[PDB]
Design a protein around this nucleic acid. Structure first.
Lengths: 78, 112, 177, 83
RNA sequence: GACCUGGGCUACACACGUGCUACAAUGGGAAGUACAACGAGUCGCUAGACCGCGAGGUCAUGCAAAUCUCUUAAAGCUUCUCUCAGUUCGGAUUGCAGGCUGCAACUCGCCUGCAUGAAGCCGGAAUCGCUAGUAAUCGCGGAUCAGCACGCCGCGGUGAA
C-alpha cells in the first residue's frame, strides 16, 4: 500500500551495507519494527527487539517479503 | 466428466452453472460467454456440441482448475514454515488485521 | 484387438532384445486380471451389493461372483456364509479391451494425477492399481451411482523379477511417474 | 461364456475432440453414428473429453500453467523498481 | 519527580449485557423513472472535463456564502429474468493484486477487484419496548476528528393494529 516504493530506515541500511565487502558480523541489534526486507539482506543475522529483548534471527530467501516485526511476537501466550 | 475438469450440473441455466466449477466466480462466466457470444439458453441448458468445445477452449486459458487449491495450499505452506506469526496463528486462525478475539471463533470452530 | 497386434508386433522383439532370451517362449506375458469390490457393509446392510454387482456388470462385461465370509469375527460382526465381496476374472481379448480402456480413457479421468505408484513389485511382478472412486469410467453416470466404492485390480504376468514387468507394462501404457 | 447371465456389450467406437481413436469396445450404446469399415460398424457415442492427450501426461507434461515466478515477485515487482 | 525508543491497554479453554447483518418470493438480479429536511465549508467543499471496471489519479473551475459545493436522497413507481432449492438467499472467513492519509500501517487503519464461499430455512424456560405521524421500516447530516462509526447527537420519507 506504498506503491511509491518500499521503506527501511536508514539507521539500518547503512548498518547492513557496511558488511557487503567482507563477511558479516553475527550481530545487528536494532529496533526492528518498521522495516520490510530487501534483497540485500539475505544471509545476515539481525537481532529483533520486542520492546523487552532483542531476538537474534538469521535471514533466508523467501523470508524477504514482509516487515521485520513478524518474528518477535510481543504476546507470549502459554 | 463433466465438461470442464469436473462438476457441471444438468437442467440449469448456463452462466450460473459455469460458476459452479471451483475457481470461477461470476465475472469469469460472463466474460467467457462474451468471448464466445452467447446468452442464457435458457433455463434448462441445451448447448450444442460446438459451443461446448468453444467454452472448453476459452476456459483452458485460466489458472482456475480443480488445482487452484494446490497453489493456495503451497502459499499458506510457505507462510507457516518460515517465521511466522501469520503462519503460527494460521495454525490457529487469525487474519491480516486481527479482531481482538473474544468472540472470533464462532465462525472457525464452534467454540461453545 | 489392436493390442494383440501391437503386442506381437512390437513388444516381443523389443523385450527379446532387452534381455536376450535363448527362446522367444521365454517371454513375460500378461495372464489374467481379477477385480475385487469389497462391500464390507452387507453384514450391516445387505442392500449395497445389490448395486455393487450392477456397477460391476457395467464396468466389466460379465456379472461378478459373490464371495462368502469363510470365518466369524465379532468386532466386525461377521458370520460365515455372509457375503462381503464380489469379483470377476478377465481373460482372452476382453483383457486387452479393458486394459486399453484403463490406459486410454479411464485413468486420465482422475483428478490431480501423477501416474501410478512405482511400487507394486511383490518381488514377483503382479502389479495392482487401487482406485478410490468408481465414477471414473464413462460406463457410469452421475445420477445413477450413489456411492464411492472401489476395486482392487490384480494384474498378473509371467515375469519373475519386477524390472521386466515394469518395462513391459511401460510398452503397454501404464503412465508411471 | 454362458447364457442369459451376461449383460450387453458391443465394440463401440471411442472418440474425442481429436484423435479419432476409434477402436475399442464398451457397454453403453444408443444412436448409431459410425457404421464404417476401418473400425467396428458401431457408435461414437463415446465422446470422452480425454484423448489420453488432454491431461498433458501421455503427451508428456507441458507448461500448461506457471506457477513458476515467485522469485521475481520481490525481484521484479519492486525489482523492476530495483534497477 | 523527569527525558526517549520499543511494546501494552486490541491478549482467549470460557460466562453475560447491549447492538448490526440474516435464515428470501412483499424476494434475488438487470434496465428505465420522480419527491425532502437539518446543517458543514479557506488550506477546506469540489464544478467541469480526461484516464482506470474500482477504491481513485490529472488539469483546471467557484466558494469565507439564500449565489458556489457536500448533494439528482433511499425505500418508492414500470418492465424482463430467476422457481422454493442452504438455492443466483447468507457473505462470515481466507489467497492474490491494488488505493488513501500517514516519517511509519506485522503487532494495530479504512476501502477496492478477483478468487474461495461458514453457520445459518424465524429461535425454550424466560423477557423487553410501544397509545400516533407513535410503533415498524429507509435514507440524509455532524460532533470529536491527517486518517478510521453497526456508536452518539439531529433531520426527514413511507405509514398500521
Amino acid at each position: 500500500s506504498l506503491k511509491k516504493g518500499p521503506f527501511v530506515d536508514d539507521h539500518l541500511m547503512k548498518k547492513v551495507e557496511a558488511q557487503q565487502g567482507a563477511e558479516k558480523k553475527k550481530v545487528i541489534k536494532t529496533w526492528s519494527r518498521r522495516s520490510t526486507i530487501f534483497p540485500s539482506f539475505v544471509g545476515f543475522t539481525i537481532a529483533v527487539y520486542d520492546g523487552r529483548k532483542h531476538v537474534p534471527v538469521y535471514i533466508q530467501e523467501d523470508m524477504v517479503g514482509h516487515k521485520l516485526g513478524e518474528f518477535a511476537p510481543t504476546r507470549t501466550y502459554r | 466428466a463433466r465438461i470442464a475438469g469436473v462438476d457441471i450440473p444438468r437442467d440449469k441455466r448456463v452462466v450460473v452453472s459455469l460458476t459452479y466449477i471451483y475457481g470461477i466466480g461470476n465475472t469469469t462466466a460472463k466474460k467467457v460467454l462474451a468471448n464466445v457470444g452467447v446468452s442464457e439458453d435458457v433455463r434448462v441448458r441445451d448447448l450444442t456440441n460446438e459451443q461446448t468445445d468453444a467454452i472448453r477452449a476459452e476456459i483452458d486459458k485460466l489458472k482456475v482448475e480443480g488445482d487452484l487449491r494446490r497453489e493456495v495450499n503451497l502459499n499458506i505452506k510457505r507462510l507457516m514454515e518460515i517465521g511466522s506469526y501469520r503462519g503460527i496463528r494460521h495454525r490457529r486462525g487469525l487474519p491480516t488485521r486481527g479482531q481482538n478475539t473474544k468472540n472470533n471463533a464462532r465462525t472457525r470452530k464452534g467454540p461453545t | 484387438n489392436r493390442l494383440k497386434e501391437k503386442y506381437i508386433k512390437e513388444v516381443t522383439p523389443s523385450l527379446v532384445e532387452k534381455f536376450n532370451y535363448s527362446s522367444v517362449m521365454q517371454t513375460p506375458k500378461v495372464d489374467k486380471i481379477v477385480i475385487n469390490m469389497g462391500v464390507g457393509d452387507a453384514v450391516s446392510n445387505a442392500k449395497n451389493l445389490d448395486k455393487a454387482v450392477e456397477e460391476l456388470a457395467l464396468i466389466t462385461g460379465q456379472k461378478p461372483l459373490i464371495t462368502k465370509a469363510k470365518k466369524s469375527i465379532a468386532g466386525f460382526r461377521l458370520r460365515e456364509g455372509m457375503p462381503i465381496g464380489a469379483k470377476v476374472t478377465l481373460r482372452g481379448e476382453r483383457m486387452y479391451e479393458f486394459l486399453d480402456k484403463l490406459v486410454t480413457v479411464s485413468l486420465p479421468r482422475v483428478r490431480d494425477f501423477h501416474g501410478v505408484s512405482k511400487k507394486a513389485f511383490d518381488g514377483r511382478g503382479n502389479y495392482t492399481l487401487g482406485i478410490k472412486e468408481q465414477l471414473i469410467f464413462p460406463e457410469v453416470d452421475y445420477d445413477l451411482v450413489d456411492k464411492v466404492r472401489g476395486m482392487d485390480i490384480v494384474i498378473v504376468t509371467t515375469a519373475n523379477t519386477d524390472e521386466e514387468s515394469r518395462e513391459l507394462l511401460a510398452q503397454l501404457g501404464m503412465p508411471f511417474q | 461364456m454362458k447364457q442369459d447371465i451376461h449383460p450387453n456389450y458391443q465394440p463401440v467406437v471411442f472418440m474425442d475432440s481429436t484423435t479419432g481413436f476409434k477402436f475399442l469396445s464398451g457397454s453403453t450404446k444408443g444412436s448409431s453414428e459410425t457404421v464404417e469399415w476401418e473400425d467396428g460398424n458401431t457408435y461414437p457415442l463415446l465422446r470422452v473429453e480425454v484423448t489420453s492427450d488432454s491431461h498433458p501426461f501421455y503427451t508428456g507434461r507441458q507448461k500448461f500453467t506457471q506457477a513458476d515466478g515467485r522469485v521475481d515477485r520481490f525481484n521484479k515487482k519492486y525489482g523492476l523498481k530495483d534497477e
